[PDB]
Symmetry: D2
Subunit: 116 residues, 4 copies
């Protein structure tokens, strides 16, 4: 609920299904510790990554495995992945949706941040 | 259900609320006849524009009133509106979502088309 | 030149070459009158559309024939065309670049307005 | 030059000027080693990062310091930075332009790869 990832495919005009997503959180020693991971559904959405308790203040990295997506579809894309890096929950809990729109040589990403 | 419009604001990181949307359909004489209109909700979504019966094959124009949106927020933007023009239902009924991501001098639009 | 149009292809990662572009100016009766046109070059650019003298304040529409571009590449696209509609304003900077990034079911456009 | 980076501002409709850009090359041990850096010019461009000799095949990361850019304009942004990660491949065209379009809560990036 606190963190959701939606992915769309600009070539097909569809949700981007079965996209692997890995989330990391910056540790006190400045390394990127694994936080959560999952795959987008048939709707292009990934829910259930974390809980309000576990999703504390910090710097998070959402890595969307765009190359693995395009290669699973038999296409040779430009980027390795799309990375979204942001400070979260620094003014108390918020709900974050990270959205991405994918093409083989381009991608756009935006955030929708709401206060419960 | 057959036609939905979602609008997001890239400056605020939020849904774009209260955005006026006008839909037109090309008539047999090549003019743009009014088809439907409405405003985005607090979620940035506009539902209820049309029915499966009324939404026949044709060329449709979805005009998103981006200038009126930015000016209602006291901002002077570049574009008059964003226009999305497409042939619909030419291989039988489909469900269309027209999405747009807005900035004062830029916007992206994509379609998600599904077969029920 | 006061107005440049640049078109890019997000599928191939290249300029979008030989794309037809039509520019219209809004007339007093709210109809769109032909203003300038051309085809993008090998660099995806279209220069020479107008001059400082002719490009007066007003509402302009740049129509990019995206459907023909995709069909020539053997790809089925969503949109009939991409349209960019804006007001030219003398108080702002002098030079307008209208950029468009094309995919089969999506496009993005931005304006880069400089002196 | 084999590698150009161009940064644009979607709020003001302008080049994004004086933005710090850092380029890294992936090392054999999977760490990111500094490769080239600079600040975008008045045209939002950063030329001169590398040469044909130095820009061998491999995985590169271009990090754009978007947070500092927005803060200097007095705007609160979402991202820490924008990152563009890609493989340089000799079979493809020779010249890579990495373009980024910035908004406070969003960015877009494309690659224009030509000969
Ligand atoms: O959950 S619904 O709103 F119903 O269906 C939708 C869910 C999500 C989206 C959506 N979210 N972001 C976008 C989206 C994101 C980017 Cl970077 C973009 O360039 C464009 Cl044109 C759209 O679309 C659009 C529709
Ligand atoms: O010599 S170059 O600077 F490379 O030629 C170029 C000139 C302009 C652009 C360019 N300007 N805006 C964009 C561009 C525009 C849109 Cl809507 C966008 O989504 C993205 Cl990711 C980039 O690309 C890219 C290349």
């Amino acid at each position: 609920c606190p963190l959701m990832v939606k992915v769309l495919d600009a070539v097909r005009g569809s949700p981007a299904i079965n996209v692997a997503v890995h989330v990391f959180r910056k540790a006190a020693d400045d390394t990127w510790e694994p936080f959560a991971s999952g795959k987008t559904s048939e709707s292009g959405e990934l829910h259930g990554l974390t809980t309000e308790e576990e999703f504390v203040e910090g710097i998070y990295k959402v890595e969307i495995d765009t190359k693995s997506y395009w290669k699973a579809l038999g296409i040779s894309p430009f980027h390795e992945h799309a990375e979204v890096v942001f400070t979260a929950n620094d003014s108390g809990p918020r709900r974050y949706t990270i959205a991405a729109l994918l093409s083989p040589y381009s991608y756009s990403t935006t955030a929708v941040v709401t206060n419960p």
